[PDB]
């Protein structure tokens, strides 16, 4: 075969100038996502517990023969686990924070950043809608250009790709290094929700309430005019009625009403609701909906398996890349350790039901070892590896050894 | 100061360009004083839009009163030799 | 579907001036630098005899920095329903334009108060009239380092055989790059070059600007094309209330559906030694 | 009221300072930048040629009837001149859509003030002091 | 123009109310207080006496070629006076950098009203009702 791609990609053309596609996005587009995430409201907090689905149940960092690691720091002995466990005290947080940018944003990007001594010190996440990458002809990313708000407008600089680092979830191809904003994707639904939001909120002012109609003159009689109507708002001023006011008139004066004009605001809000969480992605009530036929039964169970799959999907993707491109290049750099380990970052489902896993155990234990129910449950394993290793419990091992 | 109407303003407004862009697709003519309102031809400017009826589909779209064939709804500008 | 969400920029002026001077962040809208006198010779005297005083003199240069501002006002009715951001659009505007008022002051300053002046009267505009205008600076006993320069003079410039020939120039940088080329910033001994944009001087024409003394230019008699200087002895002062710099604001009306944005930047704009530079002249 | 730059015109903004924006009826067509006084109940219509019609200048084209902006007094404005004007020359509506000065005028005192000075067709910027209406 | 309270002279603030400020280029050296007029584009000098040249007062002092602020049209303000005067006078432009009255020179129309009297040489509060220009 070649050691070098020999199929072309479409991620190619004259940079952030007029035309129009999901790669080829300027710091407009970029500022436009950071609007809809600034300006709060509904669309903000939906894609906010998409964020918390797909990232806010914390992680845990696994490595593959990780005691045979075991190496000399600081005069103390580690594990590759335990040294990155020390390199990234928060990753929680930081898993969080880049995991939903690059939910909002094409991409998470950031820096590594050392100490003065140069030991590493973080990484530490830049402010997405302020960079955007420039790729070359085969569609990799060669440099990052920037800019940001400065005394008085826009300050910008170009950044070589060879140190930062970037983490994509959504793509046009697995192909695609530069990626899709799902913001932009789904701009159109996010307007429709959100001038239907207006429309009701200025329909319920005009129409949600009645109001007094007070006709003056017979039909056919003399006209009044607007100084002889003056006199007549006067006697029915709202803000001078109140609520048991009785009124004593000739004929010629009329108390007519303007009803609430009934509209079913309630389904157009329910339909807005649909369109936009299905739009991205998330089960109906995620926006406070239900449906009928839906809440229990094969048709529960489905709607939540499609979420915890496209949840698995997410978390991999964002896995994979943030060990391939964060983890490994600061073992490689600043650790004693073999950069080329089996590391693996897990991030949490956030939908485990632990007492459905217990009764798991009950019915099965008797054919998993005591670290696998321990992996399972979520706890540390036995501090004693045959322990650790054997099938019945470590209480049932304990009352016999006691036996002795 | 600057009001939306303003005439330095007009190509900032989208309602300019949509508007614009409606009057060419329902015009038959470049006459815009027989087709538009007076006030539509001010306010969209439609002296300066290329309105000519070139750009309207049902100049190019069959629609004869008599059709037994089926030939009408067909647009000349989507045939094989177009 | 959707029309093209774009606009197409205008003309963009030439930005130098914080690069091309001394920048001072001034703590105060008026001030002064101090200005210690000339050196001179120690003088002759027979033994036993009173040696007399001449003392270091002093004087000052004071700046007055005068508010420079650019302002917008739309309805709120055009900022939403707008092809593009109309607020940035504005920002951008008001901080170009006040970007461009700095350029303006330092230039003028800079050309109408140079105290040296090398007269080509046509003929060897090139290298040889920077040359001649640092040995101009140089006979009054200071060491220029800059030029700013007009876009007629760098088209002459860039024609001269001495530049345009990579044999002569010893590279051929200037005919593959121009204005770019490392040796247009590396020549005569002034280590940095200043490309000005033609607009930038005080004609007088523009509105609430009252013009500079000359005519900044390079194709007719009598035109100043070029001035080299030295960079330390000509001062930008920048004066900022709320900060070191620009400001822009962002005003909404009290009552009515009305926004707008508003720059401003206190500039002053002083030669410390007049002397030390030379304006070079078609 | 038109700048050139390249192949382009652009229009220029009628109002330059102040905020004394008020609204009206068009009793005619009018265009932005043209000289209007009082023609009937709310309604304007373009100014004549000598005192006693003037409210403002109309910022934006408009059709017969339509709602108009008026800059009034106590607003700088950006208006075309059909004579030379100098800083200090009091103007007053022409009767072209343009203003002339009060020295050319058959009138005794002019409606706005020129700060910058204009040759015949340029924009001059002047400031907007006063009304005129019916005396006899 | 100035305010004694016990040994300390004050300063008057020349603006009691208003928001009608504006700026122009000084044409010469201007006292806070002077009333001046446009000498040229967007130069203001101080006003000489009988009319014709009043843009407004001046807020502070300045040397020549400086930006100027100055009060017009709906600006309520502090003034030294040439003469008596009295509430309800009309008072412009004295010629000698204080205003006076209309009674007095040889105009027949102000730029300001009085609305608290004063002696000879010290400060009336007045509110700036018009400007003058050249009318020919
Ligand atoms: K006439
Ligand atoms: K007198
Ligand atoms: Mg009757
Ligand atoms: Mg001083
Ligand atoms: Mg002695
Ligand atoms: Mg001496
Ligand atoms: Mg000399
Ligand atoms: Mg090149
Ligand atoms: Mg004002
Ligand atoms: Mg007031
Ligand atoms: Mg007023």
Redesign the interface.
Not at chain 2, 1 to 7: A, E, I, N, V
Not at chain 2, 11 to 15: A, F, S
């Given at each position: 075969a070649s050691s070098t791609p020999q199929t072309n990609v479409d991620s190619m053309g004259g940079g952030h100038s007029y035309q129009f596609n999901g790669q080829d996005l300027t710091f407009e587009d970029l500022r436009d996502i950071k609007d809809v995430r600034d300006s709060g409201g509904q669309v903000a907090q939906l894609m906010d517990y998409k964020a918390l689905l797909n990232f806010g149940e914390g992680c845990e960092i696994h490595v593959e023969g990780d005691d045979e690691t075991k190496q000399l720091v600081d005069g103390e002995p580690m594990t590759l686990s335990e040294w990155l466990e020390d390199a990234f005290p928060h990753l929680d947080l930081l898993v969080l924070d880049l995991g939903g940018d690059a939910l909002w944003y094409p991409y998470a990007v950031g820096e590594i950043q050392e100490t003065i001594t140069g030991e590493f010190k973080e990484a530490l996440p830049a402010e997405p809608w302020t960079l955007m990458p420039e790729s070359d002809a085969q569609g990799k990313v060669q440099a990052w250009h920037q800019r940001t708000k400065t005394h008085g407008g826009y300050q910008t600089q170009t950044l070589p790709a060879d140190d930062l680092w970037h983490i994509v979830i959504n793509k046009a191809s697995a192909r695609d290094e530069v990626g899709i904003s799902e913001v932009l994707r789904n701009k159109d639904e996010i307007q429709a929700f959100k001038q239907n939001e207006a429309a009701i909120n200025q329909a319920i002012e005009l129409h949600g309430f009645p109001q007094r109609h007070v006709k003056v003159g017979k039909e056919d009689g003399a006209p009044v005019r607007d100084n002889d109507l003056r006199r007549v708002r006067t006697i029915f001023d709202p803000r001078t009625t109140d609520a048991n006011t009785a009124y004593f008139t000739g004929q010629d004066v009329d108390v007519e009403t303007l009803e609430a004009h009934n509209f079913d605001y309630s389904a157009i809000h329910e339909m807005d609701m649909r369109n936009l969480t299905t739009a991205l992605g998330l089960p109906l009530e995620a926006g406070n909906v239900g449906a009928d036929g839906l809440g229990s039964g094969k048709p529960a169970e489905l709607r939540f398996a499609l979420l915890k799959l496209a949840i698995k999907a997410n978390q991999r993707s964002f896995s994979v890349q943030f060990v391939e491109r964060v983890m490994r290049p600061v073992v490689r750099d600043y650790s004693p350790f073999d950069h080329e380990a089996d590391i693996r970052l897990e991030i949490n489902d956030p939908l485990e039901d632990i007492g459905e896993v217990a009764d798991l155990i009950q019915q099965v234990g008797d054919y998993m070892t005591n670290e696998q129910v321990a992996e399972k449950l979520d706890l540390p394993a036995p501090e004693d590896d045959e322990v650790a290793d054997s099938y019945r419990s470590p209480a049932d091992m304990e009352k016999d050894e006691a036996g002795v | 100061?600057?009001?939306?109407?303003?005439?330095?303003?007009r190509?900032?407004?989208?309602?300019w360009?949509?508007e614009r862009?409606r009057a060419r697709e329902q015009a038959y003519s470049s006459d815009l004083t027989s087709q538009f309102?007076?006030?539509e031809?001010?306010?969209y400017?439609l002296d300066t839009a290329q309105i000519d009826g070139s750009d309207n589909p049902r100049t190019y779209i069959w629609n004869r009163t008599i059709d037994l064939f089926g030939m009408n709804g067909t647009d000349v500008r989507e045939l094989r030799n177009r | 579907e959707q029309l093209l969400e774009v606009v197409m920029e205008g003309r963009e002026l030439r930005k130098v001036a914080r690069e091309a001077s001394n920048v001072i962040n001034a703590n105060t809208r008026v001030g002064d630098v101090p200005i210690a006198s000339d050196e001179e010779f120690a003088r002759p005297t027979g033994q036993g005899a009173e040696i007399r005083d001449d003392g270091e003199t002093y004087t000052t240069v004071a700046w007055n920095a005068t508010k420079l501002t650019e302002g917008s006002r739309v309805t709120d009715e055009m900022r939403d329903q707008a092809m593009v951001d109309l607020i940035e659009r504005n920002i951008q505007r008001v901080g170009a334009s006040l970007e461009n008022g700095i350029n303006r002051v330092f230039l003028t300053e800079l050309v109408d108060n140079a105290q040296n002046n090398h007269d080509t009267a046509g003929s060897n505009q090139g290298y040889q009239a920077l040359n001649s205008a640092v040995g101009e600076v140089d006979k009054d006993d200071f060491r220029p380092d800059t030029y700013v320069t007009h876009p007629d003079y760098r088209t002459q410039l860039f024609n001269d055989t001495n530049l345009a020939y990579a044999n002569r120039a010893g590279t051929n940088e200037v005919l593959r790059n121009r204005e770019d080329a490392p040796i247009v910033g590396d020549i005569a001994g002034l280590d940095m070059h200043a490309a000005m944009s033609s607009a930038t001087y005080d004609d007088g024409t523009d509105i609430g600007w009252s013009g500079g003394s000359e005519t900044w230019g390079f194709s007719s008699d009598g035109d100043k094309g070029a001035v080299v200087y030295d960079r330390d002895n000509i001062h930008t002062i920048l004066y900022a209330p709320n900060g070191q710099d620009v400001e822009i604001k962002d005003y909404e009306d009290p009552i009515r559906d009305i926004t707008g944005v508003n720059g401003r930047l206190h500039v002053d704009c002083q030669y410390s030694q007049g002397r030390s530079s030379a304006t070079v002249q078609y | 009221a038109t700048e050139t730059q390249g192949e382009h015109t652009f229009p220029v903004e009628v109002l330059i300072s102040g905020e004394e924006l008020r609204g009206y009826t068009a009793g005619e067509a009018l265009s932005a930048g043209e000289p209007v006084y009082l023609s009937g109940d709310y309604e304007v219509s373009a100014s004549s040629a000598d005192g006693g019609e003037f409210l403002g200048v109309n910022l934006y084209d408009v059709a017969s009837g339509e709602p108009v902006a008026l800059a009034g007094d106590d607003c700088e404005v950006r208006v075309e001149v059909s004579e030379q004007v100098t800083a200090n020359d009091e103007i007053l509506p022409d009767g072209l859509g343009t203003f002339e000065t009060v020295a050319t005028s058959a009138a005794s005192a002019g409606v706005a003030i020129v700060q910058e000075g204009a040759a015949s067709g340029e924009v001059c910027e002047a400031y907007i002091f006063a009304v005129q209406g019916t005396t006899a």
């Open positions: - | 100061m600057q009001l939306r109407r303003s005439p330095g303003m190509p900032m407004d989208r309602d360009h949509q862009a309102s007076e006030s031809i001010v306010k400017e | - | -």
